[PDB]
Amino acid sequence: SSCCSSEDRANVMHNWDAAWSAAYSDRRVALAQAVFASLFSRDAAAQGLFSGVSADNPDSADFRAHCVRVVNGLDVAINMLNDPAVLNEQLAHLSAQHQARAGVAAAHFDVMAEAFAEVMPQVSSCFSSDSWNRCFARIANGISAGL
Amino acid sequence: SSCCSSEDRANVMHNWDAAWSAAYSDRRVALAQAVFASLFSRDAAAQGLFSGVSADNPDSADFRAHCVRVVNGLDVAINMLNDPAVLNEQLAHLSAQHQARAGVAAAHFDVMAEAFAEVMPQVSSCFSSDSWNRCFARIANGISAGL
Amino acid sequence: ECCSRGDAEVVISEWDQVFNAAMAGSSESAIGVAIFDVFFTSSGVSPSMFPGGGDSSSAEFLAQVSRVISGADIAINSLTNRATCDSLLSHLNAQHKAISGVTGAAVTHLSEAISSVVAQVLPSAHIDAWGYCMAYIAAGIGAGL
Amino acid sequence: ECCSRGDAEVVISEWDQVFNAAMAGSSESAIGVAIFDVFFTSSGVSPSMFPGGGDSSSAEFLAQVSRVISGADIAINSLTNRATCDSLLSHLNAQHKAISGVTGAAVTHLSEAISSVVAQVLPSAHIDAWGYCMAYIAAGIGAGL
Amino acid sequence: ECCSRGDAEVVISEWDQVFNAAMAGSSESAIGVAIFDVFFTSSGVSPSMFPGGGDSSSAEFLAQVSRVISGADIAINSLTNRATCDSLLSHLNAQHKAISGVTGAAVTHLSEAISSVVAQVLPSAHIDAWGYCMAYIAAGIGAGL
Amino acid sequence: DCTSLNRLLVKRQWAEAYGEGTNRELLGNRIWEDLFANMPDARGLFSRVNGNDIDSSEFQAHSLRVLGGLDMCVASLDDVPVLNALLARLNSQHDSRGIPAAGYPAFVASAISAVRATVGARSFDNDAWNSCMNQIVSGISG
Amino acid sequence: DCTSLNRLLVKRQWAEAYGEGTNRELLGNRIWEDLFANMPDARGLFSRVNGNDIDSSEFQAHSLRVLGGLDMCVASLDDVPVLNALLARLNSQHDSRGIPAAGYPAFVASAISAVRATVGARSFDNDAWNSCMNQIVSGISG
Amino acid sequence: VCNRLEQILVKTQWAQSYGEAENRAAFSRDLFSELFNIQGSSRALFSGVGVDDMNSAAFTAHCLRVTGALNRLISQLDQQATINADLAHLAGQHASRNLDASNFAAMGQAVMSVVPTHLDCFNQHAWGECYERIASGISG
Amino acid sequence: VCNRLEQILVKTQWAQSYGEAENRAAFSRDLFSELFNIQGSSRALFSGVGVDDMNSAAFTAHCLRVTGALNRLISQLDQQATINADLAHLAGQHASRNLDASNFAAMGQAVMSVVPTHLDCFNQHAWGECYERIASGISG
Amino acid sequence: VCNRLEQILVKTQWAQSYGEAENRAAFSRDLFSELFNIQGSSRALFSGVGVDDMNSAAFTAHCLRVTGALNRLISQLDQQATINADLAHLAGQHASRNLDASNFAAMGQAVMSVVPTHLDCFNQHAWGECYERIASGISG
């Protein structure tokens, strides 16, 4: 399990910041929509877990709001990479929230990671794949702990 | 009607600041006294409008206080030249005050402008006449609006 | 001068502050529709004379709004090169001469709507420099109208 | 030393802070009259020995106050060039030798009035450096008195 | 352009090299008389049309030479501000319009005499920039002649 | 009203105040310090996240979640259906926490002051910020 | 008493705090923010000049007029007859505006704190500033 | 053509090149200089805008109109109905010019040659797709 | 008036001020700004050279003509017959202007107010004498 | 002589020259250097203050006394009764020196030659008037 280094965190925070639309939700929705389309293609059963947010219509306001929440949650975590004490509390918070959702399992996080790995090079310039992979693992593993 | 430009405002604020006595009222009184002496020479009837401030004795405390108020009012306006939104409220305020004085007319402001144009080169070093003329107009026209 | 090099720099800087890295590319439509709303009120010009009849729900009018904000952008950004700006304005003038019912007064109203909306989204705006420079723009677009 | 180069620089800087661009040229009379008020109280010297009898309403005394503040200014500003300062002080010494009833103790009282008034208008004043440097000034003016 | 900003800077620099701190104020007459000698040869214009009849021993002609070199100096030094230069040239144009027998061709010959004498005293002179910029000067002075 | 031009101003100023990740903590601290000074009894609502030590990791993570919540809403101000779905969820997250209604106007005041302090008073528009913040808290609070 | 030496100190420190035109607004804002925090009901007296939005053009012009008024008085501290004529006019400008007497000591405290913040605490003299400000407000307030 | 993710790359990279250019007139003239150098026969199409002197006010104004149009289009890539209308308008403006596919291809090469020299990162494919979206709309 | 040694001081000090000025147009406009500020009534004399806008091409051109004339005169202070002829020419150019002694005095004050602010060293008397030489020649 | 407005110019310009001088002793010595260079016969008047060596402590002290006096006078130009008294005092101090009008004229030239080289802006007339005010008071 390769470590998400200080250098990796710098790379990831740079890629993430450079691609961010700070005043409008449309870009983060598009990013997340692509991630979910990939996730659901890879694991058709996973879509049922999202019935509470209208996953059956990914263009719905309900699902688009979920997309905003997910990208927000990841944005907050990424921005905490240089303060891991705080990161740990955030990931523990997210973990509790996912524990509360019946059927969400650690294996799903591996599929989610594949989905981000596919989508990020399509939205980020000079995207650093190795640093992303290691630091996404750092974050995802924290959320998936206990499930 | 030639515009009081950003460059003009810089020139005027510089001339004004360089000649200002920041801690004592004597210099601003002398400046204003010279302006009023010029105004009253040019327009003898105008002096009657100032009967409420002892214009008949320009060396009186009453008239010297008026001089302080006038130079203050112009100092505040000049210092607002780089914030015209705020300038507009100040000139509207001054306009209302002059509207409240029976007999004060727009023509008087032209005579006042002549008086300042005569006096400023006698108190200001490297005085920029064109910039002063344009920016004094900007201020005076705002006060004389509606009369 | 009227719209001096210094005035032009202030106006360009303030337009750039409105359309900064966060806002550029995402806010043009909202800024543009607001400019048109102020323009219609001040000028009394019929929305029906515009593509899509001035309806903000119509793609034809939204495309018109995109063109107008972009045209304003191009003119504003060229304010420090007066010869180039004069040419841009002459081109816009020709385009409006070909359109029935564009008046000099109405061109003035639209230019002042740009300034007023800018001051609404950017409270610190130098309203004098905007007035002088938008008047120069209006004079060029509205020439002979 | 007593009134070192460093002490002298502090004193000069603080005198300049009191008589800065806003205050220089307009505040000398008020500073001077206050110095004389403190001096008369501490020294017991008769106001009648001065031009205009120490009356602050008299132009003759106001002119005396102007001379004294200026003399102090010249000495203070020369504190970092000791040879020049010594000469200024010797000239002042000759002037006071020609005046009946100037004592060494009284010269000390006036020098300390300068320091005390400075500290009143400038709360942050380095009272030690003022003491050392005004003592050097008093020693020179008051020599043989 | 013809006589670009860059060309103008070269010409101004080279004129300044000729009339540098050692030479300025002492060499104008000699430079000027030489310019006139080349001009008279190339243009066929009569010396008699000039003050003092073109006689270099005559104070009236020497004063004319002083005026011409100074006029050239003023125009050359304003080459980087085209609007100001155009005005200087229009003034000179009016002055020559009032003089019988000044032709466009002759104005060209005098401008080229300036360039040629400059190249004689300054071997490194940029003869192309001098040609372009002196042609701009000649066009202005010689307008309508 | 939180008008179209208000939303444009609030979006731009929020992006300035929050757009760079470092000093997100500085913005949050400005809010909580002010809120707890004005409404000390509010501190107790945050016991689970260590509200006595706002500098603690637990509180700092909470603070950054709050700012992220605000970011979601500001980013979505132009899309009312999405905004309403975001506020619906925030409402669920605040109900039955014993939060007094007075806590919301207090937070709005603290947040506006914090943004104002960050972006500078000369560019600020209190009317725009109040109107838009009030739209947000109306969706969250009972 | 506002003594001759007090007046010298207040003049010099005022000129430092107010003498450069930029940051006149910063000095004013320090006063109003403090005053309205300590005396919230005072904000209502300024309704005509948009006291709810101290950053508004209307309020900022008012703020700068107030500072100009103070400048006139400080500049004239050495000339009591002129000072009295200035205060007489200021008195007319404040009468029948429903201003409570308590508003004046509050403003004096806010103004002194603002100047102190601007010029630095080490050079400051609270006694001088209180004495001289009290002379001023005594002429303005009923 | 020109999907929602490709649009993110192109918007971001246009912002970092055109959006950050210190001399917008020079950037815009460079586009046309590259166009003429790629396809010499294109230059004559611009005889109505002072092209004989590329530093002229007239030609510079044309260049600025073009990059301003590229900017306004890129801003609307995600608003299908709006950009379609705007592209139709531009198509009307180019209809009488009797342009051909080689002309649009050369302009694409010019855009994609100038833009990356202003960037640390450039995505060729996304730019090709979104340039195609614009070109097809204008060719009509 | 204006002896051979005085000429040395004036030539040297003109070289160090006018001669070294980075902005000759600004130097020349400053001369006239000081003139008008010294004697307000002089300004109207210049109504034929665009004086209403001192930054105009027309007025700047006038100012440059004047300092250029000062330069060419200063260069010839030592050549009596030549400068006398040149001064007579200028006298002809000013004859119809109905100038008076106060006008020449004000111009002398302007020259002697501008020049020393560009110098480390200035000799008032030499400048007064050589200005008088020029003024007397032009007044005619 | 030396009106209230002229006083403003002179006070401001003295503040910007003397008031801002980094080396007050050098400024003051320069005044006397210019005086002696203007009127060589004036130098011998200063034989009691070590004038043979202008860099001496004795001569420098004299120079500082003089510019300090100029400073204290300029500060009181607006206080007629006070400056009149101070000028009378100085007149008493100069009475035994048998000075003449040429000496006061030369000092005026020295003052007005040194001061403007320390300034961006200088008003010759105001300085002449206020120097005359001082000189007349001291000449007695």
Ligand code: HEM
């Ligand atoms: C690093 C990756 C992830 C992040 C940052 C993330 C973040 C979030 C956030 C912020 C919420 C909203 C929580 C709430 O309001 O209760 C959420 C909800 C949810 N997440 Fe994730 N998540 C991640 C991965 C996953 C994975 C891999 C799955 C499983 C397939 C998953 C399943 C869910 C479900 C079912 C919900 C509830 C949706 C609803 O509101 O009905 N998440 N997630």
Ligand code: HEM
């Ligand atoms: C830019 C130029 C001017 C400025 C800045 C100015 C400023 C002022 C100010 C600050 C006041 C005191 C207001 C109050 O306390 O009510 C005042 C009063 C007055 N002004 Fe002006 N003023 C200007 C021009 C004029 C002109 C041209 C006239 C007409 C001749 C005029 C006539 C008066 C009168 C009659 C008063 C009332 C005096 C009194 O208190 O009895 N002002 N002005």
Ligand code: HEM
């Ligand atoms: C500062 C003022 C104005 C600016 C910057 C401006 C700008 C523009 C621009 C850039 C275009 C697109 C031209 C093209 O590509 O064909 C346009 C078109 C148009 N403008 Fe204006 N305009 C202004 C004022 C006005 C006014 C006052 C009116 C109405 C009275 C008006 C009516 C129109 C119409 C009808 C079109 C044509 C729409 C079409 O059918 O294609 N404009 N304007």
Ligand code: HEM
């Ligand atoms: C630090 C201490 C002192 C300083 C700096 C000082 C400075 C001066 C100066 C500069 C003068 C003007 C000299 C001139 O131009 O003729 C003067 C005069 C005078 N001083 Fe002092 N002095 C000091 C102490 C004293 C003391 C202690 C006394 C009294 C006991 C005194 C009594 C006088 C008198 C009577 C005059 C002459 C006034 C006249 O008739 O012209 N001084 N002093």
Ligand code: HEM
């Ligand atoms: C580049 C070309 C030239 C320059 C820079 C030039 C410049 C001047 C100047 C500065 C003056 C003085 C004007 C005044 O103050 O009245 C002058 C006068 C004169 N120029 Fe030229 N000139 C040029 C060409 C010519 C040519 C080609 C001729 C003859 C065919 C000519 C004939 C004269 C004459 C006769 C006068 C008038 C002398 C008098 O009676 O006062 N100039 N020129």
Ligand code: HEM
């Ligand atoms: C615009 C205003 C506000 C926003 C955007 C906001 C946002 C949030 C967010 C995102 C969370 C975390 C939700 C979760 O994942 O469980 C939260 C939790 C919380 N908020 Fe707010 N909030 C706002 C105002 C307030 C106010 C005014 C109060 C009370 C005075 C308050 C009290 C709380 C409490 C007590 C929690 C739970 C802390 C815990 O985890 O134990 N919030 N808020």
Ligand code: HEM
């Ligand atoms: C030293 C203290 C003060 C000074 C120098 C001062 C000065 C001023 C000045 C110059 C004006 C504008 C007058 C005009 O042109 O109409 C003004 C207006 C006003 N002042 Fe004061 N003021 C002081 C204290 C206060 C205090 C303590 C209060 C109340 C708590 C107050 C309340 C007002 C109000 C309500 C206005 C009118 C606002 C309006 O235009 O509607 N002032 N003051």
Ligand code: HEM
């Ligand atoms: C695909 C990207 C293109 C964009 C965004 C674009 C944009 C524009 C714009 C905005 C105008 C000015 C319209 C007006 O206001 O009248 C214009 C004119 C023109 N364009 Fe394009 N254009 C593109 C491609 C091309 C190509 C590939 C060519 C030919 C090689 C071309 C040739 C012309 C010509 C000849 C004009 C008319 C110039 C004139 O007025 O004489 N354009 N274009």
Ligand code: HEM
């Ligand atoms: C003593 C130094 C002076 C010099 C070297 C000088 C030089 C000149 C020169 C070179 C011209 C342009 C001649 C031409 O080419 O037509 C001129 C024009 C003129 N000068 Fe002077 N001048 C001096 C003093 C004055 C004074 C003291 C005044 C009046 C206050 C004055 C008023 C004028 C006027 C009115 C013109 C005509 C402007 C026009 O063309 O309308 N000059 N001067």
Ligand code: HEM
């Ligand atoms: C008008 C401006 C002048 C001022 C402000 C001035 C000021 C002074 C002062 C302050 C002293 C020292 C008095 C003392 O403490 O004993 C002094 C001394 C003297 N001054 Fe002047 N002075 C002026 C002009 C002149 C002129 C024009 C001359 C002659 C060219 C002159 C010749 C002297 C001499 C000879 C002494 C005596 C030196 C000694 O002690 O041997 N002063 N002056």
Ligand SMILES: [Cl-]
């Ligand atoms: Cl996007």
Ligand SMILES: [Cl-]
């Ligand atoms: Cl004064």
Ligand SMILES: [Mg+2]
């Ligand atoms: Mg911590």
Ligand SMILES: [Mg+2]
């Ligand atoms: Mg504001």
